[PDB]
Amino acid sequence: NRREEILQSLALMLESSDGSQRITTAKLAASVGVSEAALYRHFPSKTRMFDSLIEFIEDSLITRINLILKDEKDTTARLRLIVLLLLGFGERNPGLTRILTGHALMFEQDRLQGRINQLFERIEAQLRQVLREKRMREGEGYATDETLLASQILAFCEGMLSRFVRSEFKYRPTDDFDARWPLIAAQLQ
Amino acid sequence: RNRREEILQSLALMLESSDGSQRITTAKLAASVGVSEAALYRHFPSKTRMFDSLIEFIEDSLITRINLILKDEKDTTARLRLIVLLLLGFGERNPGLTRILTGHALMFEQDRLQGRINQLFERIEAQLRQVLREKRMREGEGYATDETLLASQILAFCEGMLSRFVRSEFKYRPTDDFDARWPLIAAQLQ
Amino acid sequence: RNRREEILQSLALMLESSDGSQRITTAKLAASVGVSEAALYRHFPSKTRMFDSLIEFIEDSLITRINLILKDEKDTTARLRLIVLLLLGFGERNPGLTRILTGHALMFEQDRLQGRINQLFERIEAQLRQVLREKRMREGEGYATDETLLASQILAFCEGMLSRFVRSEFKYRPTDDFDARWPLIAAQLQ
Amino acid sequence: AEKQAKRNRREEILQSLALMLESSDGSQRITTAKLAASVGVSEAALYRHFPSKTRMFDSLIEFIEDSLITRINLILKDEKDTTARLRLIVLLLLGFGERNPGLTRILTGHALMFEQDRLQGRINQLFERIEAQLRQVLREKRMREGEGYATDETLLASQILAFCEGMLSRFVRSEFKYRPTDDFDARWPLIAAQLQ
DNA sequence: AGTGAGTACTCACT
DNA sequence: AGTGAGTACTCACT
């Protein structure tokens, strides 16, 4: 109800040019058009607010990923879509990206970053499962170690999101993706 | 100065420790330095300037070593490798300073600092871009991909490795497994 | 409300006390009110704003009663008399606020405030310059002096009295001996 | 030499301290650091000429006192006429003030707001002395010219001094715009009119 | 509305 | 160069 009102606002702010700095509960209570006192009648703490966004993020990405695995059988085609998914989500959610990159959580309690870490651990496991299965599905595996291959993929992704935030959202992740994919693909050897 | 350097040295140390995940208050800083909060403003006008010094130290150290690699290596691919390895290596032996490079430690300071960091990254990219453009003259053949698209591709990998380095509280060493990683980057040199 | 005015009142009281000769830090002001400093910013953005309210109060209380004097009384010499008494009276009644009229209490605050106090005096001298010129308008005679010089001369007096009032730690009350002083002023209305 | 050299600097500081007090930055704390800059030494270097900052204003106030007092005793000699003496003494107050805008911020008590209260007390004694002196002039009028004054001698001095203090206050408020000694010849006639 | 501990920065004497 | 005590103002939770 109002709980979503807040979150939706916390993000919009997290996306604005003011998201690059502490988002006080007061300045937040204003965006919502209520009082700080109200805020705490929906959330036990500011931390819980971020925890809910992290949960949303995790849900959107994990769900989308599992669907990708059902709609596509090709090992490579799978990765291509999974990478585009991350880049796409990030681009479509600048504010939530500041959470993915960890920047926004700098003002919050550390435990929240551990959460984003697990999210990533979860995304890596998937990427790893996909390549691990190329063997059964295509007969031949990979030259490079599977684990190392997924980190290389993930690394490119975090890096693209990191830059996206640096430039203040001027450097769009999905830009020239069609031309970039051939480069990442040339790594799956 | 001795004290000026002594402060900056503690700044980075604090950025490397657990305290790096939070704001570096002039209080705690002076605590670690072993002086009075006022002593700080004796060698530095503002806390912001302290970060500016660190940024310059990063700028210089990186640009300097990059230019040395360019003068000591004529191979386009070997140049690219050493440059990428230098970015990573620096990051690993300067956990505190890396937290700046990634932009995390700059969240509590003046936005201008980030712009400074963006200029560095643009400067580093230009170097990668010049190195790629020269392969045509030097080795004759050019690159399938787009020179500009290739630098951003290499850069992305590097910013990605430093990002995770910070997330894991410095457990994921950037240079670990680099030799087995490089061949993957070499492949993108289409 | 119950707290905004409550703060302002404690602010003037400190301006009236011996502390009034020393900057009124938010730390002390908070103590005097019996709350935490933060609480102060719950009803006031900046300490400067607290002085603004106090200045507006002075501006209103004065400009108001002055006009009423011009509306009710119509005798020139009687008008000037009452205007002077009002200035002194208000001063004596508001020791702390007088410390602002003189500009002392504003030495630690924004330079803008002094301007707000300077304009008030300008407005006051204005009213005076008006009554002095209307002399020929009603009595058909003119002062053997410059109307502008006359008001300034009268104002000068008043400012001097409030000035001494402050210096003396509020021992030299402004209104004391007024009834025997006025003749000295009237004598100037040649 | 050595002593006259330290006094050349001890007084060199003051020359700067007042200079700053005269400037537009006079309406705000004149910290030691900034002061040492006006001249070219360090904090510790400043303290080898003065025990503290207070002691700096004292010497400045002392200078103030000497100027007015001395210049006043001389006024009493080179002039016997009561009214003529009052016209001068007043002109001296308004003059010394306009001639040293930085020091006036000290007379008006403004610049002192930053310093220790005991310093304002010293200025309070100065005014009292100038008033007692003014009171003397008014009293002697009788012996000198036969008659005295209608109003009380004390009330008359305060009335005149109030005008002065008031003139110096505007001079500071307008940021040294409203010059005191402006139209003195025109104003005085208004002041004498009170000498009844 | 109210606050505990904080937040980068300052000053006169050292 | 070094600091004890400031300074005006802030914040997430009350």
Describe the protein in words.
The structure is a homotetramer. With 189 residues, the first copy, chain A, is mainly α. Chain A has one domain (1-189): Tetracycline Repressor, domain 2. Helix content of chain A is 71%, strand content 0%. The first copy, chain A, has ten helices and no strands. In chain A, α1 (2-15) packs across α4 (46-71), α5 packs across α6 (94-100) and α7 (111-132) crosses α9. Chain B binds a DNA duplex (14 and 14 nucleotides) through residues 1, 3, 23, 25-27, 35-43, 46-48.
Helical proportion of chain A?
over 70%
**Relevant CATH superfamily of chain A:** Tetracycline Repressor, domain 2
Most residues in contact: chain pair: C-D, 41 and 39 residues
Query: What is the quaternary state of this protein?
Result: homotetramer
Structural class of chain A: mainly alpha
- What is the CATH topology assignment of chain A? Tetracycline Repressor, domain 2
Shape of chain A: elongated
Query: What is the total number of structural domains of chain A?
Result: 1
Q: How many runs of DSSP E, i.e. beta strands of chain A?
A: 0
Proportion of β residues of chain A?
Answer: under 5%
Order of helices and strands of chain A: HHHHHHHHHH
Distance between the termini of chain A: 49 Å
CATH architecture classification of chain A:
Orthogonal Bundle
What Rg of chain A, in angstroms, do the CA atoms define? 18 Å
Total helical elements of chain A: 10
Q: Using the coordinates above, name the CATH class of chain A.
A: Mainly Alpha
Q: Mind describing the biggest β-sheet of chain A?
A: none
PDB class: dna binding protein/dna
Keywords: dna binding protein, dna binding protein-DNA complex
Assembly: hexameric
Entry title: structure of no-dna factor
